[PDB]
Amino acid sequence: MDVNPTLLFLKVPVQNAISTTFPYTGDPPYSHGTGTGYTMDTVNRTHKYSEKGKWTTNTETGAPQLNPIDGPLPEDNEPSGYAQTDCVLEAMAFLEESHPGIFENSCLETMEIVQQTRVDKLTQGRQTYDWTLNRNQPAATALANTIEVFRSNGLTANESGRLIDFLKDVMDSMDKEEMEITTHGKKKQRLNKRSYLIRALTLNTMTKDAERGKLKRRAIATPGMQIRGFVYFVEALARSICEKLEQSGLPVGGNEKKAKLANVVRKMMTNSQDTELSFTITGDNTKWNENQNPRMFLAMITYITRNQPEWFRNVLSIAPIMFSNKMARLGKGYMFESKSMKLRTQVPAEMLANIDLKYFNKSTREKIEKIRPLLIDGTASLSPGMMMGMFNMLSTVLGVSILNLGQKKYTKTTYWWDGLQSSDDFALIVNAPNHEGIQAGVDRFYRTCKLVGINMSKKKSYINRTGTFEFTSFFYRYGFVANFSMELPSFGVSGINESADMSVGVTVIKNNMINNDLGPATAQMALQLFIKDYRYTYRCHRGDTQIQTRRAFELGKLWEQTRSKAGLLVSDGGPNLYNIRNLHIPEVCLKWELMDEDYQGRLCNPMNPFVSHKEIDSVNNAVVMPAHGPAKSMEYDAVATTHSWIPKRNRSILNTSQRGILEDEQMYQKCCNLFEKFFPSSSYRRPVGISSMVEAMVSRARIDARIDFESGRIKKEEFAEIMKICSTIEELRRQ
Amino acid sequence: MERIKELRDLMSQSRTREILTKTTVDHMAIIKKYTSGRQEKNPALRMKWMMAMKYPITADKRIMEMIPERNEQRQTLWSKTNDAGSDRVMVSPLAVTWWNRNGPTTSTVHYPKVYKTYFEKVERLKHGTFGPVHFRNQVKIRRRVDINPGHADLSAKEAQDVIMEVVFPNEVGARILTSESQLTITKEKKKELQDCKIAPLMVAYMLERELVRKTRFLPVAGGTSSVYIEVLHLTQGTCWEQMYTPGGE
Amino acid sequence: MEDFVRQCFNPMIVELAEKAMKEYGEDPKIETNKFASICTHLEVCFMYSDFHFIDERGESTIILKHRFEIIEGRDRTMAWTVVNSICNTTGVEKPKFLPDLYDYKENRFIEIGVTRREVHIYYLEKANKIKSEKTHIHIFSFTGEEMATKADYTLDEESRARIKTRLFTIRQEMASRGLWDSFRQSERGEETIEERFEITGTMRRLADQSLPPNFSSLENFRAYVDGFEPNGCIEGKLSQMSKEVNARIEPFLRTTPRPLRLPDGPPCSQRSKFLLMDALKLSIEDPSHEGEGIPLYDAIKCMKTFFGWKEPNIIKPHEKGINPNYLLTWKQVLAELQDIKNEEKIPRTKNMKKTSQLKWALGENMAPEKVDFEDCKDVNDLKQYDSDEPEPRSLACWIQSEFNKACELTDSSWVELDEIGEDVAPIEHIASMRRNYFTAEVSHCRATEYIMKGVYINTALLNASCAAMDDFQLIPMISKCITKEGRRKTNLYGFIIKGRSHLRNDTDVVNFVSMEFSLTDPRLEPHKWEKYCVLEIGDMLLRTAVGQVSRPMFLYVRTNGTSKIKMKWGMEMRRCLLQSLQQIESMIEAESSVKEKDLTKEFFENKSETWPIGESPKGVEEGSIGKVCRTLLAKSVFNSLYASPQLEGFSAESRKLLLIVQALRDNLEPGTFDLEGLYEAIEECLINDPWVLLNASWFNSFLTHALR
Amino acid sequence: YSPTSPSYSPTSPSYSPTSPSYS
RNA sequence: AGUAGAAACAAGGGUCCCCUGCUUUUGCU
């Protein structure tokens, strides 16, 4: 008897046991060294899929750029970047015709958004590339550095605080003949026009980690602060358009996406009934971001913004223009070793331009030789493609337009098609009287996609009668089935803090019960396993136990001191009172009535030093990386207690030359903290004011002192002392 | 008093004076988020790795004078070392436990009022009545519902201005309240929140949670009401239905 | 007029006026009448407030408290703040608009105005504009005229005279300049400026180079797009496109699919972090729950119970290693154990001496020295790091035996779950009984023992790595179980010595040496133990049914490595259970929705329903629901233990083939566009991983059984 | 509930090689 | 040696001692 779990599929349909095919209990693959090889491969592939294009030399950056738009029509089934401008414009026009006024209303909404957005809105990013430092930094730090440099270079249009003013500042800086930057011992560095322009158009490349379902690693890119605002406005417009398209899978959630898929399936099923065949294609596009051209996005944006104010069109056009002249950094470089001498060394990517090729292996040597002509200032020129892939919504608009082209009035034949699109993923459904019509419709859709630079992957796609299909790991078999394994990694200690972790674990169990068909008994067992993992991770075993930990003595003392032991939190060595019925109740309020008065007062003491509250946007909110997709924001219910602490931070920066920024950050915090003591609402809603910190602080202090003296809360001596100190601050500010 | 003295101390230094004078109120939203710390990539792994260290937690400086340096068992509770990029100190989890057994007690009577939503949930569960379980084929439709029992049908703007009036009366600005519902809500909240030591930001967040309606797409099968979507996980199953009636209207 | 105003006022007044007008976004050099009006208003208000204090009783005083509070000449935020604070503290209802200042002796807002026109006109205008009945209004005139509400002049006659004199003299200076007549004040018109955002300079040059090939400027492209109409463009270019571009549908029939091609090469070898089916444990009786006692004390006790230790000797040497170092490592472990034994104090951790054998076995100083490129560019053999494909291996029969063993039932319980809240709802009671069945079936599975061993080992290794990254720490391999007689037992599998663990990256490797007891002779399957050096350490007198039989006892010693991410995922092996259990529940519930009753008891007790789960020489074997649960648990555990990019790729690619085969079995007429491409994608993931090779072989078996 | 399996052989496992009794 | 797999770890910096364990490298709805 040789056990073979796959044989279980002989009785259970594959969908109904699809969880068996997801090995999400082991660690996912990770990159170990450099991503330079992946970046060079991506650049070479992008330039190869569009090689029958026009080669030009940029007059500004002096870089070789490849233009495949309106190139020779494809003659084979290999990926092609030769999108046709007329075809793209025709698709956009027909999309507008089928949904009249969509572009106009979307443009009105985006125009309203553009004039009200603030520059600080750019702080809600993640590891933006910083040209001032030439490395990745958090979005807020990069924005602050860019604003500092702009101010030091006589570019202060952003004082107004509007995002569009910052974009005007970037526009003007592009015209500066010399840029002055500060490098850490402060040193002044001067960048000529071309050098600064190349830096402003640079994308920093790295390699993706914790990616499931792949054997080989791939490269991703992140842009700098010079293009993020333009991308933000373009994506706002694209989101506005997508929200009004029923065939678009964005920006809706999973449940709404499944609802849309079910709706379209039913719509295409009732129509057929018994008079025609219907076939579903579980499709997938290959090299999505390597064959989308920024020039085509410029064309679509131009068409969308017809009959609109010139400034709006210019603002929306900037981002495709800058992406058409982008450059990619080639990662960290490579590592060489000498076995005989037992040495290892790091070769930066900047030296790949004129380094002897005897060091590299055959494949790397070929990559470097192929990419050498594109190298400028340590970066590779990449005109075609969308490596960074920030236009996830414009691409969705193009896919939805191709889908909309499938209406019977546009096919002008017996076959027609409809479906759903979400970035590079799509599900198609073709209805036709017979199999020949089905083949004709499939061919028409494939060729039309090819005409606009979309290449369906034939190796990862299949077609079957429209009863079952798959869409981004949602498996439909006459109704969507549960895929519990996809959520397995989320079951565990999140790593925020004790209170947040308990809340998130319980909430995840509840949500999986609601959505992923987690059964009651399995839910109870998951609760038990989570409690065990929580106790082990936080060393908060029950007080009565004899498990030896550094925290055991204090927990035992608290346990022996307590009278009502059921009231203690699990973090405090208490029992687990959670079950199915109360999965929606936070722990502190679950056992509020069972807690001792003194323990309750100590635990929920607002003066405790462990609790620290940031802005409201981060209250009871955590960032969680799912198994698939980008990091999400999850909100949990929890009472602020002594268990809502914050873990320490990395200290490696203390050993580098960037250590100077640490102190700077510290200084800022001081000032900001002081500002909270004068304007307590500042952490709730962002304050606005052109005046400096000092003026507002002194005004508020004077006014509060006077009002308090009027109310009799402060004696005249204290009022005089405060007025004297305020006068001292006022006179000291001038000098 | 303390505010102005701290402002003077800040103004004494040159770098802090330059920061204070050369930064506008708009630029504060940017310089306050200025940080060298990257958002954690693998919080679970980092938490497991950090809990094996002596001092994984951060605390305010006041802890130095509020809990002893060492335990009765000579177990160190906090270290003098400052957290990177801040004046907070590194402390061990033991300190937290210490505070939970020997910390200064305070009266907790506004907490059920401030966290009204959670305690409403627990009270609703306490007085609910369960029925039988029925084993039958369950049909679930993915529909939009509102997970917020007791919301006052306030959107972002109106809820935010009501919260501003209740929690930060002097910072309300130009806005005034007209609808009688807003006035009565504000009056009742101000009366009940009088002399509350909970953090104002937490109070504002809880008021927003209690007053603003939220919606979600969920696969519902039975009644579509807030009090019922609250226990959806308990009432509906793949093949079973649990008859239940929440004890709160 | 600008210079006259700037030179005739206190710098503070003019500066406040500039900041105020800039707050509105206007241009001081363009609008000046408004500047003059606001500066005069500021001057008069400051004279109003100046020289007015309040004594202790609350009466007037002329040269401490300030009688008036100014509102004008401040940012809208600060003005609104001051008015709100005044209204809140004093009780006077705040006005809809912004007043000029506030008096406190009478506790009410007072408005000041300066206008050439007659006092009554401006007074009525502002009174009907503000529409406030509790705020004073005090209008002054350039000619000296002045009036307020009810003729009630709040300021002293001397102060009013001073204000009138100052206004008269500034008016006289304005007349002297000759611009007095052409001033006539200026009312705020609230003009609106259209937004503009131009593309010029380098930006326009870049834009002109971001267009299709046949366009020279962005303006030309915009003009073309704005006048574009659809005229059969797509149809024409579809007509032109070559017919070789197509998505031809290849029918997927029962004779279409072929078995996957597994790689060829030497047989695969064991690569788990600990022995699975060849593990041997020395056991003791002690009443301790999970992770309660001191591991070293338990290990010493377990060692004591075994009599029959022997001088160790190499049985199966590690081909690529130095086997005497392994022998010396085992001897050193024994000596250190004796040393701790004769201590009368058992530490929570033991640090092993940094001997030569442990230095070699743990890769001490094996990293190359890091040097600058300029200092070694001339080295003859300097070259890029080896980045070739892993060597291929062929499937071996031991992995299937391992899985079979892992699917079996054990006599001892291996997991004790924590308490939960009491059941109050009927559904909770049903869940409790169903979970009793699940816990009984899953606690007595060998895969659960593997879960416990892996969790313990990974937790200990990670904790040691963080706590002491410079010491060689001895970590016993311990598990706890409950026998069928209900008595607790502590089992020792062997020992682990971790090396230096300065783990910075998540993929950084900490090396360790594992020494594990076994009864398996390595010479039966040498290819499985390529990485191991196997010793003979004793003769164990096994107690069998008929009597007692002597068997050699072996010590499998090897060097292994693990990273932070691998350790973290090994610490979370318990979730494996959930996977299998979830799949089991959905299988019972699916069958309970058609019979209107719970079938858990029927499924688990009577074993009426079975599922095909195994293969036999006679045919496909069917197992009960418990057997299916245990098999899925074993599959999850082996996924966790043998994780690799090969497994991820194979799973992702073979899912599509499984779905296509299912569509064929549902008679949905499946079709493919490039089936050979899918087969190549699947087969490129099968290189050397025994678990992935076994999964591919399982897929081949299922494929041959599913199409007949 | 006591789990049982038909594959259990009362005699084939003369001694358990993983958890045997050795006095 | 071992981990591992398309490139890395097998400690890295600084001046016995000191610092560091995600910080030259993790994007986007």
Author numbering:
A (entry chain B): 1 to 184, 206 to 756
B (entry chain C): 1 to 249
C (entry chain A): 1 to 63, 72 to 716
D (entry chain G): 1 to 23
What does the paper say about this structure?
The pre-initiation state structures show that at least in vitro, and using highly purified recombinant FluPol, the preferred position of the 3′ end of the vRNA template is with C2, rather than U1, at the −1 position. This leads to formation of pppGpC at the beginning of the product, consistent with the NGS results, or alternatively, would allow efficient priming by pppApG, if this dinucleotide was already available from another source. Continuous density between the two sites, with 25 connecting residues coming from five CTD repeats, is observed for the pre-initiation state and the elongation structures, whereas for the replicase-like structure, the connectivity is lost between both sites.
The viral RNA dependent RNA polymerase (FluPol) is a key determinant of viral host-range and pathogenicity, and a prime target for antiviral drugs. It is a ~260 kDa heterotrimer composed of the subunits PB1 (polymerase basic protein 1), PB2 (polymerase basic protein 2) and PA (polymerase acidic protein). We show that the CTD, jointly with ANP32, enhances FluPol replication activity and we demonstrate in structural studies that CTD-binding to the FluPol is consistent with replication activity.
